[PDB]
Amino acid sequence: YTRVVWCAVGPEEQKKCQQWSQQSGQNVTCATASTTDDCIVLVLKGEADALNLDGGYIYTAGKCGLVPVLAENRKSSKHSSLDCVLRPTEGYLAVAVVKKANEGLTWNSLKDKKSCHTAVDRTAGWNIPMGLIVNQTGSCAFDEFFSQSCAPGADPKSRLCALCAGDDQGLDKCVPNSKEKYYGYTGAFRCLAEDVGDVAFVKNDTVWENTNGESTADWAKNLKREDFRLLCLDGTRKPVTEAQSCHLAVAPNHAVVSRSDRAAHVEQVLLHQQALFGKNGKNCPDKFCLFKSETKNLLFNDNTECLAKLGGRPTYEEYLGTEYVTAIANLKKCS
Amino acid sequence: LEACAF
Numbered sequence: 365y366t367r368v369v370w371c372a373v374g375p376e377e378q379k380k381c382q383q384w385s386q387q388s389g390q391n392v393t394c395a396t397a398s399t400t401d402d403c404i405v406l407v408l409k410g411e412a413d414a415l416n417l418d419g420g421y422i423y424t425a426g427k428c429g430l431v432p433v434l435a436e437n438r439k440s441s442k443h444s445s446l447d448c449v450l451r452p453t454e455g456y457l458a459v460a461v462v463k464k465a466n467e468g469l470t471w472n473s474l475k476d477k478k479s480c481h482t483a484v485d486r487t488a489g490w491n492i493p494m495g496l497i498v499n500q501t502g503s504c505a506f507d508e509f510f511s512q513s514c515a516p517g518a519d520p521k522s523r524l525c526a527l528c529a530g531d532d533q534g535l536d537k538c539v540p541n542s543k544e545k546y547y548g549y550t551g552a553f554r555c556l557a558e559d560v561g562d563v564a565f566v567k568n569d570t571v572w573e574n575t576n577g578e579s580t581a582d583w584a585k586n587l588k589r590e591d592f593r594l595l596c597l598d599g600t601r602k603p604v605t606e607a608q609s610c611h612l613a614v615a616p617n618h619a620v621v622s623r624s625d626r627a628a629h630v631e632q633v634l635l636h637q638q639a640l641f642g643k644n645g646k647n648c649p650d651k652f653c654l655f656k657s658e659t660k661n662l663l664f665n666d667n668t669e670c671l672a673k674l675g676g677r678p679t680y681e682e683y684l685g686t687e688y689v690t691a692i693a694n695l696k697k698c699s
Numbered sequence: 700l701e702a703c704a705f
């Protein structure tokens with residue numbers, strides 16, 4: 365068998381990857397790059413094997429010939445006797461989140477407000493909301509819609525990065541990795557929690573996992589769910605218990621991609637590494653938990669129960685689904 | 700809506 369070379373995005377991921385590599389007896393080793401697109405290039409060069417990707421990045425990777433291998437499966441809403449690895453994935457709910465106290469704001473008055481996005485090119489943070497906004501405004505000028513934003517990966521001098529904050533030192537402002545304070549689901553939801561933004565584009569799970577004590581993180585530890593509302597596309601505002609009726613889209617779960625030539629082996633190695641380090645794995649929490657990182661969603665989302673086998677050996681289009689593929693293609697026409 | 704970005 366060969367070792368599998370994981371690609372870690374930024375130094376926090378790299379630190380986790382190195383602990384995993386040590387715990388796996390070097391069955392997994394680590395390459396690191398600054399951004400997800402760079403990891404994708406290491407994988408296309410064959411200098412890394414795999415990483416787990418949001419569906420907007422799966423589209424980038426898939427256009428370049430990389431293939432989905434296993435998908436993130438979180439706890440199911442409904443009962444299933446099937447093992448996690450075989451239980452079908454469900455898709456997460458992209459939402460637009462505001463503060464309850466910001467009473468006047470709805471979907472229809474977002475123009476000129478401040479927004480917080482997980483990063484450019486990610487599903488709930490970018491492709492879904494900006495694709496909807498471009499379509500509804502009839503204008504590709506999405507860089508001018510919000511007065512200011514944090515949208516990691518955008519030009520650091522532009523309004524789309526104005527609200528980003530960088531790392532502890534204020535370096536790396538707007539870089540699309542966990543060094544940036546407002547990066548990712550938890551960093552965009554923190555951008556809203558701290559009222560840096562008026563709106564955060566994240567998924568439903570984000571709000572629940574970072575409120576009412578579910579996170580002990582200093583910035584989250586004291587947030588109340590009731591202080592937040594979801595923006596629905598019909599212009600109404602709802603409590604965050606209503607995401608199933610007040611979302612912008614259902615997103616394909618994050619998934620591992622690799623070169624086609626390495627997919628079989630990546631899939632076999634990961635199935636084994638999660639038997640050891642996954643949720644109730646033989647060596648988690650004793651030795652190392654592959655799906656934990658103190659809320660920071662490093663390498664995998666912290667809410668991942670297991671990586672699950674895909675039905676029908678799907679291509680990346682099949683995996684993402686035809687509508688979402690078309691939605692991205694249409695939005696990408698703007699650039 | 701075509702080629703690899705890299």
Ligand SMILES: *[C@@H]1O[C@H](CO)[C@@H](O[C@@H]2O[C@H](CO)[C@@H](O)[C@H](O)[C@H]2NC(C)=O)[C@H](O)[C@H]1NC(C)=O
Nearest residue numbers: 439440441457568569570572573578606607608
């Ligand atoms: C929104 O996300 C939250 C967090 O994932 C979901 O709430 C969880 O649902 C699971 C399965 O029902 C429960 O067993 C967990 O206890 C819940 N977590 C928390 C922190 O309350 C919720 O179901 C999602 N809402 C929708 C409509 O999908």
Ligand SMILES: *[C@@H]1O[C@H](CO)[C@@H](O[C@@H]2O[C@H](CO)[C@@H](O)[C@H](O)[C@H]2NC(C)=O)[C@H](O)[C@H]1NC(C)=O
Nearest residue numbers: 491492494495496499686687688690691692694
């Ligand atoms: C933005 O608008 C485009 C243009 O209508 C949407 O694309 C259409 O999606 C439907 C269903 O997926 C297809 O049958 C049409 O053929 C598509 N049109 C084009 C030009 O491809 C797209 O879904 C919208 N983006 C969103 C909703 O995020």
Ligand SMILES: *[C@@H]1O[C@H](CO)[C@@H](O)[C@H](O)[C@H]1NC(C)=O
Nearest residue numbers: 365387388389391636637640
């Ligand atoms: C590493 O992989 C080898 C080969 O499959 C396997 O025998 C061993 O159990 C694995 N050990 C760890 C810690 O992953």
Ligand SMILES: [Fe+3]
Nearest residue numbers: 418419487488
């Ligand atoms: Fe995502």
Ligand SMILES: [Zn+2]
Nearest residue numbers: 611612613614
């Ligand atoms: Zn829906």
Ligand SMILES: [Zn+2]
Nearest residue numbers: 676678679682
């Ligand atoms: Zn197929």
